[PDB]
C-alpha cells in the first residue's frame, strides 16, 4: 500500500544485490561505481516525492513526510561520501571491496528506513539492521587486533543498548493496550505514570547510544581508534543522523509531549556532553580519537536544538546536522589521505605538512576551523543558529556553556593547524621528511571542502529546505 515512498530504498536495496552478485562472479570488480550511481539514483528519487505529494503512510508502519526525506537524503549522502574514501583504503588492505560495500549499503538502508519508521516493530528492525552492519564494518580489517577488540566492544555495548531499548518498547506496547503504532500510543496513554517514565528512560538509553550522549558515550573513543577510518566517517555522520531522526520521530510523536521530562534528561545529557567531550578531547594524541571526542561534543551541541523545541531549535538542529556532514566528511577524507600516503599515524606526525603537501593542509585546516566555528565557513553559521535558537527560547545556561566549550574546542582544533603549517625544514616529523609524491578520494575531498566553505554564506537556499522539513515535527 503506497509503496511509492519505497522507490528510494529499494533502489539502494537493488544495488546491495547487484554489487554482490558481481562480486560472486567477477571478484575483481568496479562496484565503487554503480554504487555511487545507486545512491545518486536513490537521492534523485526524492525530488518526485519531496514536494509533489503530501505526507503519505505505507501502512501506518512508515511515513514519508519532508522530515523523513531530509534524514533519508542525509544518510544517503553520508554513505555516498563514505564510498569515495573507502576505495583505495580497503583495497590497500588485503581485503575485498564488494563484501564491504554490501555491508555499507545495508547499513545505509537501515539508517534510511529508521528515519521514516513510526512503528515499534519496524523501528526495532531498522535499528538492528543498522547496528549489525555497524559491528561488521567496525571489525572488517580482521588482521589488526585493535579492529577486533573495537568490534567486540562495540557489539557488546550495542547489543545491551538494544536489549534495553527493546525492554522499553515492550513496556510501551503493554502500557497502551496494544498499539504497536507510535501515534496510536500517544492517544492511548496521556498521563505521567511510573511505567511511562521507565519506558521513556529505557528508550533514551538506546537513543543516546546512537547519538553518543554521555554517559552513553564510552564506546566512540574506543571504536573510532579501532574501526577502519571510512567506517568511522560513515559512523560519525550517518549513525548520528539516524539516531537524531529516530529521536525526533520517537520522543515527539510517540512519547506524549505532555511528558516532557525528556527535555530535562536531554538538558542533562547535553550539558554533560559539552563539558566532557570538549575537555577530554583537549588531551589527545591521535587524530581519530580526537575526532571521536569532538564528535561527542558536537552531538552535545546539536542536543540543544530539540531540547528547547520551538520550530527554530528544530531548524537549528537540522541545519547543524546538515553542515556537520560537510565538516566531518572533509575532516575524515584528509585524515584518510594522510594516513594513506606515508603517515598511518597520529597528530604529532602532522608537523611540517605545509611544505610537502599544501592541498591536504588547506583542505584539513578549513574543515577543522569549520568544526571550531570560524567565520565565513559552514560551521560558524550552524553554531550561531544553534545558539540563537537557544537564547530565543530561554536556555541561557545551555548556550553560555556551548560558547565556552566552543572556545575550548577552538583550542584543540587550531592545535592541529599549528603542526600542519608552523614547521620549518628542521621540525618536520619523521613521516613528512620522507613524504612521497585515489582520484575519487581527491574528488570527494575537494567537494566536501568547497561545500564546507560555501554552505555558510550561501545558506539561504538550504534554510527554506530545513524549514519545510521542520514544519512536520509535532508540537
Amino acid at each position: 500500500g503506497t509503496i511509492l515512498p519505497e522507490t528510494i530504498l529499494i533502489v539502494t536495496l537493488l544495488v546491495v544485490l547487484l554489487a554482490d552478485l558481481i562480486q560472486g562472479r567477477q571478484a575483481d570488480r568496479w562496484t565503487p561505481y554503480f554504487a555511487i550511481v545507486g545512491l545518486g539514483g536513490a537521492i534523485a528519487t526524492m525530488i518526485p516525492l519531496w514536494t509533489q505529494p503530501a505526507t503519505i503512510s505505507f501502512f501506518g508502519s512508515f511515513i514519508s513526510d519532508h522530515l523523513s526525506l531530509f534524514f533519508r537524503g542525509l544518510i544517503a549522502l553520508s554513505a555516498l561520501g563514505t564510498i569515495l574514501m573507502s576505495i583505495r583504503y580497503v583495497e590497500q588492505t588485503g581485503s575485498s571491496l564488494g563484501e564491504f560495500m554490501t555491508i555499507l549499503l545495508t547499513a545505509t538502508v537501515g539508517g534510511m528506513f529508521i528515519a521514516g519508521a513510526q512503528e515499534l516493530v519496524f523501528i526495532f528492525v531498522a535499528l538492528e539492521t543498522l547496528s549489525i552492519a555497524s559491528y561488521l564494518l567496525t571489525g572488517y580489517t580482521k588482521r589488526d587486533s585493535r579492529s577486533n577488540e573495537a568490534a567486540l566492544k562495540y557489539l557488546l555495548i550495542g547489543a545491551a543498548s538494544s536489549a534495553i531499548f527493546l525492554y522499553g518498547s515492550s513496556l510501551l506496547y503493554g502500557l497502551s493496550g496494544g498499539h504497536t503504532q507510535l501515534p496510536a500510543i500517544a492517544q492511548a496513554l496521556s498521563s505521567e505514570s511510573l511505567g511511562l517514565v521507565v519506558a521513556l528512560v529505557f528508550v533514551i538509553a538506546g537513543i543516546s547510544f546512537k547519538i553518543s550522549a554521555v554517559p552513553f558515550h564510552q564506546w566512540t573513543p574506543d571504536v573510532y581508534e579501532g574501526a577502519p577510518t571510512p567506517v568511522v566517517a560513515f559512523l560519525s555522520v550517518g549513525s548520528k543522523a539516524a539516531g537524531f531522526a529516530l529521536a525526533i520521530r520517537f520522543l515527539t510523536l510517540a512519547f506524549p509531549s505532555v511528558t516532557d521530562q525528556w527535555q530535562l534528561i536531554f538538558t542533562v545529557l547535553a550539558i554533560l556532553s559539552m563539558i566532557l567531550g570538549n575537555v577530554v578531547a583537549l588531551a589527545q594524541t591521535s587524530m581519530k580519537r580526537m575526532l571521536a571526542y569532538s564528535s561527542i561534543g558536537q552531538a552535545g551541541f546539536v542536543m540543544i536544538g530539540f531540547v528547547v523545541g520551538t520550530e527554530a531549535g528544530y531548524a537549528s538542529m537540522l541545519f547543524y546536522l546538515l553542515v556537520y556532514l560537510f565538516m566531518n566528511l572533509g575532516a575524515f577524507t584528509c585524515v584518510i589521505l594522510f594516513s594513506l600516503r606515508t603517515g598511518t599515524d597520529q597528530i604529532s606526525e602532522y608537523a611540517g605538512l605545509y611544505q610537502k603537501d599544501p592541498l591536504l593542509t588547506l583542505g584539513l585546516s578549513l574543515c577543522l576551523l569549520s568544526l571550531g566555528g570560524i567565520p565565513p565557513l559552514a560551521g560558524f553559521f550552524g553554531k550561531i543558529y544553534l545558539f540563537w535558537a537557544g537564547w530565543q527560547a530561554g536556555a541561557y545556561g545551555l548556550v553560555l556553556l556551548g560558547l565556552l566549550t566552543s572556545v575550548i574546542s577552538i583550542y584543540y582544533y587550531i592545535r592541529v593547524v599549528k603542526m600542519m603549517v608552523v614547521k620549518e625544514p628542521q621540525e618536520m616529523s619523521e613521516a613528512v621528511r620522507n613524504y612521497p609524491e585515489l582520484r575519487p578520494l581527491q574528488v570527494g575531498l575537494v567537494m566536501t571542502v568547497i561545500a564546507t566553505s560555501l554552505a555558510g554564506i550561501l545558506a539561504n537556499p538550504l534554510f527554506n529546505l530545513v524549514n519545510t522539513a521542520v514544519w512536520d515535527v509535532p508540537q
Binding site: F59, F62, F122, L136, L175
Partner: protein, 168 residues
C-alpha cells in the same frame, strides 16, 4: 478453584523456578560448558512458558532457533575456544562485581515497583486459539516492512559473519 487452573498454576511456578535456577547457573557457574547446556535449559523452560500463554507457534519457533540453532552454535564456539582457562585474578574485581550486584538489585526493585503499581488493562476476553494464521496475516498486511527487511538483515549477517570467521 479448579483442576485445570491448579495445573496451569503449578506448571507456571515449576517453569519459573526452572528458569530462575538455570539462569543463575548460566551466569554463576565456573565451568562454561555447564552454562552452555543450562542455556538450552533456560530456552526450553521459556518455550514451555510460551505454550502456557496461548502462544503455541512462537514456542515451537523458539525451540527451533534458540535450543536448536543458537544453542548448537554456542556449543560449537565454546569448544573452539578451549585453552584450559588460566584466568589470573585481577584486583579491581570486587568493585565491579559489587557495582553490578547493587545496580541489578536496584533496577529489579524499580521494575517490580513499576509492575505492581501500574493499572494494566486486562480486557477479559478469551484469546484466539488459531494463533499461527493470525501471525501469517500480520506478516503480509501490517508487518510487511519488517518481514521484507529481515531477509536483507539475514543476508548481511551471513555475509559479515562469513567474512569475519573466514580463514586466510
Amino acid at each position: 478453584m479448579d483442576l485445570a487452573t491448579l495445573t496451569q498454576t503449578i506448571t507456571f511456578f515449576a517453569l519459573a523456578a526452572a528458569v530462575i535456577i538455570a539462569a543463575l547457573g548460566v551466569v554463576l557457574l565456573d565451568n562454561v560448558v555447564y552454562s552452555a547446556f543450562l542455556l538450552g535449559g533456560v530456552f526450553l523452560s521459556i518455550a514451555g512458558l510460551y505454550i502456557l500463554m496461548n502462544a503455541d507457534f512462537v514456542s515451537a519457533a523458539q525451540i527451533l532457533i534458540y535450543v536448536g540453532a543458537v544453542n548448537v552454535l554456542i556449543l560449537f564456539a565454546i569448544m573452539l575456544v578451549n585453552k584450559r582457562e588460566t584466568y589470573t585474578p585481577v584486583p579491581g574485581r570486587w568493585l565491579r562485581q559489587g557495582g553490578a550486584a547493587v545496580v541489578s538489585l536496584g533496577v529489579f526493585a524499580l521494575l517490580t515497583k513499576m509492575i505492581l503499581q501500574t493499572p494494566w488493562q486486562l480486557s477479559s476476553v478469551p484469546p484466539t486459539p488459531d494463533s499461527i494464521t493470525t501471525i501469517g496475516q500480520h506478516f503480509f498486511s501490517d508487518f510487511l516492512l519488517p518481514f521484507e527487511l529481515a531477509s536483507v538483515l539475514l543476508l548481511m549477517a551471513l555475509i559479515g559473519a562469513v567474512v569475519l570467521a573466514r580463514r586466510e
